[model samples]
Target: KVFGRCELAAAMKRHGLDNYRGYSLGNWVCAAKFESNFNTQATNRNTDGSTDYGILQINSRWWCNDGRTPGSRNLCNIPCSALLSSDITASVNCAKKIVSDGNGMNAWVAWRNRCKGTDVQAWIRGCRL
Candidate 1:
């Protein structure tokens, strides 16, 4: 499913993404915007043969196991299919695990290029979080 800006913001807030790992909800919103454009079913295959899954685009290389990413660590210990669910619980939890593992938000390339060191507040502006 695709989400509106505030729709996604509300979901992220409900999932405790606000202020996660010193990153504000806006940063998350901005990152998701660029990562998958808020589409829960989005997937992108990396040149290395790993695939990014779900709205936040968690990768199969080190976070989730797709059974196809060679040497995948499955650090999140969940099937990559979990990330495709609209519930988003698995996706959010995996994202947290990635951050807590010291990867931080930069684990997402889109976050670094589009949301990092920028005015991400605009990404959540006018949202009733």
Candidate 2:
């Protein structure tokens, strides 16, 4: 099941996430749909048999080594699997940082802007509370 909205909202607040309500559930669904089709425990492998895992589609080799891990439970030492147990808000906040800070969600925003027939960046910019 998806996380409760209030629980996810609070987690976003703890991380200094702005515009939590606007994007929390929608972005969660969007990211999940884009990444792994909402399967939290989903995994895939390369031709070499190395595994990529989790809802966010993170590669285990990227974030889950040398004692660093993801998620609130801390049990998901693997990259993608951690997303399954992660604080939803933390995940959303991280995504926002990655999307906006990296490139202002240029690709995503552009796609949404075109599809929705409006300015996605302006919508995001106007988002508060």
Candidate 3:
């Protein structure tokens, strides 16, 4: 499916999220808006001149090369590029494994809150498995 706001919302709903209430969707959208206006295939050089790619601003070099290799199996096995290449479901699942370990959704909520306004990791503390 094509990656867009609608698809992203559907992906979140499938994963039990009602809206962009908690996750970094707002932050991501902001970043996307500033970066490429929510373009899923966006790519550009960071301020530090590093290469950034994809909707979530995944780094191409780090995640594309070494990150593709198997190191931590418990975490998601797919590389960031692979996740980016696939649908939002795959990307979200991969992120869930890495950040939340398939447990609670608070990490995502915290990320969203961080972008919304706050900087504290308070969202992380309130997560219940």
Best by TM-score: 1
Is candidate 1 or 3 superior in lDDT?
1
Candidate 3 per-residue C-alpha lDDT over 1-114 given as tens digits, one digit per residue, 9 for 90 to 100? 335554554454566533233454444333333444445566666454444445555443334432333332223444445544545555545444434444333333433444
> Tens digits of per-residue lDDT for model 2 on 5-41?
4443344445655444344333443444445555555
Two-way TM-score contest, 1 vs 2, winner? 1
How displaced is residue 53 in candidate 1, in Å?
A: 0.3
Worst 10 residues of 2 by lDDT: 66-75
Tell me the lDDT of model 1 at 46: 94
For model 1, the stretches where C-alpha displacement exceeds 4 angstroms are: none
Candidate 3 global lDDT: 0.44
- TM-score attained by model 3: 0.45
Q: Could you give candidate 1's per-residue lDDT for residues 43-62 as a string of tens digits? A: 99999999999999998999
